[PDB]
């Protein structure tokens, strides 16, 4: 609910909404237009009887009922399909704890064992570590 | 450059060269960026100064 930023003394008629459209609205379609709705068979372009403006106001005052308050509505649309991920959740990090058996989930690789300091010569682009037989051996700390 | 499953990848490496132009000495080549382009790359063109 937004009764503080969409309301004030002496009233406010800033917002608008449409009740008279030639047809229904396709999902995710914007219909920004000021076209007078036709009534009967007149080509009337104006305001008055049988000649209605397409959009009306959402006049807001700090004193209404609950069903008339200026609710702030935000809808989040997502695409959960087979496509490269670009926006996603806050992956959480923890401490390290060296020289101790521990389950590790470094940046998506999961395994078990003991981790400690090393003297690799890791190239800056390098992220993983392996051996002759393709087994994850050394992991660079993503936060250190 | 390549566009395997999208994910445009660019690998760059700068060598001061020798008196020749295209040398024969080996020069490893390191990645620089990889971003999810996901478009049908078919044609290629360069820009001049």
């Amino acid at each position: 609910n937004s009764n503080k930023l969409d309301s004030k003394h002496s009233g406010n008629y800033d917002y608008w909404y449409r009740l008279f459209r030639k047809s229904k609205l396709k999902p995710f379609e914007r219909d920004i237009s000021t076209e007078i709705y036709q009534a009967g068979n007149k080509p009337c372009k104006g305001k008055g009887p049988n000649c209605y403006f397409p959009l009306q106001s959402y006049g807001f005052r700090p004193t209404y009922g609950v069903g008339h308050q200026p609710y702030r509505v935000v809808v989040l649309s997502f695409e959960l399909l087979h496509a490269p991920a670009t926006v996603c959740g806050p992956k959480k990090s923890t401490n390290l704890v060296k020289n101790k058996c521990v389950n590790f989930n470094f940046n998506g690789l999961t395994g078990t064992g003991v981790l400690t300091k090393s003297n690799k010569k890791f190239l800056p682009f390098q992220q993983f570590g392996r051996d002759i037989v393709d087994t994850t051996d050394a992991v660079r700390d993503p936060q250190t | 450059f390549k566009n395997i499953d999208g994910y445009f990848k660019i690998y760059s490496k700068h060598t001061p060269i020798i008196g020749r132009d295209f040398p024969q000495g080996f020069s490893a080549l390191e990645p620089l960026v990889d971003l999810p382009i996901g478009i049908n790359i078919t044609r290629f063109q360069t820009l001049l100064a």
């Binding site: 390098q126 993983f128 392996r130 | 690998y11 295209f22 024969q24 490893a28 080549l29 990645p31």
Partner: peptide, 24 residues
């Protein structure tokens, strides 16, 4: 303008396929 001369690439243009460190 430009030319279309052809030259031999020799041994050239090998990049790191992955980011996994190796040695020896």
């Amino acid at each position: 303008t430009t030319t279309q001369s052809y030259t031999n690439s020799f041994t050239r243009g090998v990049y790191y396929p992955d980011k996994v460190f190796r040695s020896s």
